[PDB]
Amino acid sequence: MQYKLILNGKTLKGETTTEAVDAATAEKVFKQYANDNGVXGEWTYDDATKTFTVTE
16 A cells, blocks of 8 residues: 655655555656656665665
8 A cells, every 4th residue: 555755866865655556556656756856767666665766
């Protein structure tokens, strides 16, 4: 349910979570969140904790 997002950008470092039932939907939500935050870059995620990491 709770998917995690670690934003490790150049001017934005932090983490947020969302209630998603589908990992692809979660990824889309997080990418929308990231783009809306004005960031983007390399995506590395671990399903072990369901943590999506945005690295610049």
